[PDB]
Design an enzyme around this catalytic site. Structure first.
Site, PDB file in Angstrom:
ATOM      1  CG  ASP A  59       9.113  14.602   5.624  1.00  0.00           C
ATOM      2  OD1 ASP A  59       9.074  15.364   4.802  1.00  0.00           O
ATOM      3  OD2 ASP A  59       9.016  13.340   5.179  1.00  0.00           O
TER       4      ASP A  59
ATOM      5  N   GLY B 205      11.334   2.707   3.035  1.00  0.00           N
ATOM      6  CA  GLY B 205      10.817   1.517   2.963  1.00  0.00           C
ATOM      7  C   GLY B 205       9.171   1.206   2.751  1.00  0.00           C
ATOM      8  CG  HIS B 206       8.825  -0.944  -0.508  1.00  0.00           C
ATOM      9  ND1 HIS B 206      10.007  -1.276  -0.567  1.00  0.00           N
ATOM     10  CD2 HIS B 206       8.433  -0.257  -1.689  1.00  0.00           C
ATOM     11  CE1 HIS B 206      10.601  -0.669  -1.588  1.00  0.00           C
ATOM     12  NE2 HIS B 206       9.522  -0.004  -2.480  1.00  0.00           N
TER      13      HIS B 206
ATOM     14  CB  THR C 238      13.683   6.865   0.002  1.00  0.00           C
ATOM     15  OG1 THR C 238      12.898   7.816   0.559  1.00  0.00           O
ATOM     16  CG2 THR C 238      14.027   7.030  -1.469  1.00  0.00           C
TER      17      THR C 238
ATOM     18  CE  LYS D 181       9.357   2.820   7.413  1.00  0.00           C
ATOM     19  NZ  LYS D 181       9.329   4.230   8.054  1.00  0.00           N
TER      20      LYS D 181
ATOM     21  CB  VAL E  11      -0.989   0.175   1.073  1.00  0.00           C
ATOM     22  CG1 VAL E  11      -2.060  -0.857   1.096  1.00  0.00           C
ATOM     23  CG2 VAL E  11      -0.135   0.089   2.506  1.00  0.00           C
ATOM     24  N   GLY E  12       2.212   1.171   0.077  1.00  0.00           N
ATOM     25  CA  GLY E  12       3.003   2.313   0.026  1.00  0.00           C
ATOM     26  C   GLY E  12       4.363   2.084  -0.375  1.00  0.00           C
ATOM     27  NE  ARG E  13       6.286   1.235  -6.009  1.00  0.00           N
ATOM     28  CZ  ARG E  13       5.457   1.107  -6.672  1.00  0.00           C
ATOM     29  NH1 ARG E  13       4.192   0.509  -6.575  1.00  0.00           N
ATOM     30  NH2 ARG E  13       5.645   1.845  -7.869  1.00  0.00           N
TER      31      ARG E  13
END
Ligand SMILES: Clc1ccc(CNc2ncnc3ccccc23)cc1
Lengths: 267, 346
Positions: free
Chosen positions: B152, B36-37, B34, B55, B30-32
């Site tokens: 961030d 981690g996935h 830098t 993750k 569901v997400g990528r």
């Protein structure tokens, strides 16, 4: 690194790694089948000094070195000296501790170089042969250290509380250098596994006051602390200095290290 | 290790929980990133039925970034901050997995939904915006009081729990846990405080609060208040965007600006006269937000140009906006139906 500084009472350090002294000695009985209780303490002292030496070579600040020392004590509080060679664990602990910081980086070559140099120049009385482990062994050991500590990496120490107390006393020039130095020596013992940091700090400041003949009775009275636990800690500090007098690690450590239980090889 | 005790080694390996035995997740990315996935994951050993987020940390081993993220997640516990459940160290590939409760929603997708309905609504439940803001500030405040910064902050990083026991609850995620020397100068800009763009050398609490200000303007309007073309800390067009919205700071508004490394470049590139009829008032009026609303006055304290004149998170939680009807709800959806779709599987 003030991260988490006020959170000790909800910290994994407090809830998980203030151990019971009886559980400690019970898990210690397995390595006491090869080593007396003196010899186990002398070892502990030795690897504290080894970890400190590494920290200094790498110009790490004392708090980082303390955390590394504590990683090491945690690992062997549960497991036998035979499970992983403590010559491999000590530099692993330093490396891991130092990656918990964002100011600076310890490279692979630099870590290995520091380990090789420090054993040769400063610990040749205990180690004839050269540091035999490559970085791949360090990375393996890291994974077992992380696993065992349940990923609890943030560790509180007595230096911060001690500063607050000496500043509060208005006595930083007279007492801080000595007290700080005594705090360093507490890591030669189990104290950081058994009491919260501010209590070790208070004990250290008391001993410093006694050595410098400074009357602090009213300052300590004005605190709200279990003073019997503090006295417990003082007595451990005083005794450590008696074991230090009577100990010649340079003459004794090769022999105590030969008595350490040894890893079983695979079939 | 040849010379690591065999019994110890096989015993730890027999007992070691492996991520792939406990969770079903392959194909469910569901997400990528830098960093981690992320996978949606359900529990094989069926003594549970909730969704989870897995993750997989990018790279191998324990990097300084990984080490700090585990170390801090391991300690932090607040209802409005994503909570690490479990770490898996996979010894074969030296990959690290982190386990979280799954969050169906986030503000990037929520805001994008309402912006889609402008083609053919602006946050339907009355106190959803307020409630979102209050919880963001609550969790940021927890981090700031532990001397942890986010660094961030942006809508995609503000998750929102869906159906379940924590329905409608904000979960701040994806803190930037490693920044060498705490520096933004070391290896979009829409949520970046002006002092960053003028070369601030360190992250601060106040930089996080600016980002919260930007998010709150975006929840009120559905547009990023400081939207900018996608064209060294100095970014000229992003500064141009800030000033068209806000006006150009007067010497009195931000005295220490002259100490910013890029101040002289700002003087070379910009002229006060260019923005003389620009103000946050005028901007927010054009988006149907009243300038004498408590919402507007809090927003203006959060988007203060001088970082030292920016309100803290604790002062913002005490703001009388949160006492005015309607009060913030612990479920930002306030019992209403969730019209927002679920997560697409990347
Ligand atoms: Cl815009 C966006 C896109 C993709 C994600 C996927 N990331 C996640 N989804 C659900 N729960 C999570 C828990 C912890 C960390 C990440 C999670 C989030 C936001």
């Amino acid at each position: 690194d003030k991260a988490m500084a006020g959170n000790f009472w909800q910290s994994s350090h407090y809830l998980q790694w203030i151990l019971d002294k009886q559980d400690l000695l019970k898990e210690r009985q397995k390595d006491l089948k090869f080593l007396s209780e003196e010899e186990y303490w002398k070892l502990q002292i030795f690897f504290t000094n080894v970890i400190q030496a590494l920290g200094e070579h790498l110009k790490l600040r004392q708090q980082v070195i303390a955390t590394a020392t504590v990683y090491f004590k945690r690992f062997y509080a549960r497991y036998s000296l035979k499970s992983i060679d403590p010559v491999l664990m000590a530099p692993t602990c330093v490396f891991l501790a130092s990656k918990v910081e964002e100011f600076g980086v310890v490279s692979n070559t630099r870590l290995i170089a520091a380990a090789t140099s420090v054993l040769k120049t400063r610990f040749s009385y205990a180690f004839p042969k050269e540091f035999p482990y490559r970085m791949n062994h360090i990375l393996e050991c890291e994974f077992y250290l992380l696993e065992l500590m349940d990923c609890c990496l943030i560790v509180y120490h007595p230096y911060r509380p001690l500063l607050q107390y000496v500043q509060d006393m208005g006595q930083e020039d007279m007492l801080l250098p000595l007290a700080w130095r005594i705090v360093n020596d507490t890591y030669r013992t189990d104290l950081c596994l058994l009491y919260p940091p501010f209590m070790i700090a208070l004990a250290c400041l008391h001993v410093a006051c006694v050595v410098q003949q400074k009357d602090a009775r009213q300052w300590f009275a004005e605190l709200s602390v279990d003073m019997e636990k503090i006295l417990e800690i003082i007595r451990v500090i005083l005794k450590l200095y008696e074991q230090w007098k009577n100990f010649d690690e340079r003459k004794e450590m090769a022999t105590i290290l030969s008595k350490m239980p040894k890893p079983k090889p695979p079939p | 290790d040849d010379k690591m005790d065999y019994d110890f080694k096989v015993k730890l390996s027999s007992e070691r929980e492996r991520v792939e035995d406990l969770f079903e997740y392959e194909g469910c990315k569901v997400g990528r990133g830098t960093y981690g996935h992320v996978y949606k994951a359900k529990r094989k050993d069926g003594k549970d039925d909730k969704d989870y987020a897995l993750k997989q940390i990018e790279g191998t081993g324990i990097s300084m970034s990984a080490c700090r993220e585990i170390a801090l997640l391991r300690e932090l516990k607040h209802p409005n901050v994503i909570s690490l459940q479990k770490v898996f160290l996979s010894h074969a590939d030296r990959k690290v997995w982190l386990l979280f409760d799954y969050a169906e929603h986030d503000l990037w997708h929520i805001i994008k939904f309402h912006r889609a309905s402008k083609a053919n609504p602006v946050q339907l439940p009355r106190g959803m915006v307020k409630s979102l803001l209050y919880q963001i500030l609550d969790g940021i405040h927890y981090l700031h009081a532990n001397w942890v910064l986010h660094r961030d902050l942006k809508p995609a990083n503000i998750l929102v729990m869906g159906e379940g026991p924590e329905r409608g609850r904000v979960k701040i995620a994806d803190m930037g846990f490693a920044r060498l020397f705490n520096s933004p100068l070391k290896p979009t800009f829409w949520y970046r405080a002006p002092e960053l763009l003028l070369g601030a050398r360190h992250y601060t609490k106040a930089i996080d609060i600016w980002a919260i200000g930007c998010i709150f303007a975006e929840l009120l309007t559905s547009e990023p208040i400081f939207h900018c073309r996608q064209e060294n800390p100095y970014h000229h067009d992003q500064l141009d965007r800030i000033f068209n919205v806000m006006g150009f700071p007067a010497d009195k508004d931000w005295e220490d600006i002259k100490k910013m490394p890029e101040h002289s470049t700002l003087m070379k590139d910009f002229r006060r006269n260019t923005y003389t009829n620009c103000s946050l008032i005028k901007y927010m009026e054009k988006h149907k937000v009243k300038p004498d609303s408590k919402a507007f006055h809090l927003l203006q304290k959060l988007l203060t140009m001088d970082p030292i004149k920016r309100i803290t998170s604790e002062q913002a939680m005490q703001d009388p906006y949160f006492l005015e009807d309607p009060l913030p709800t612990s479920d930002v959806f306030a019992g209403c139906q969730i019209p927002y779709p679920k997560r697409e599987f990347l």
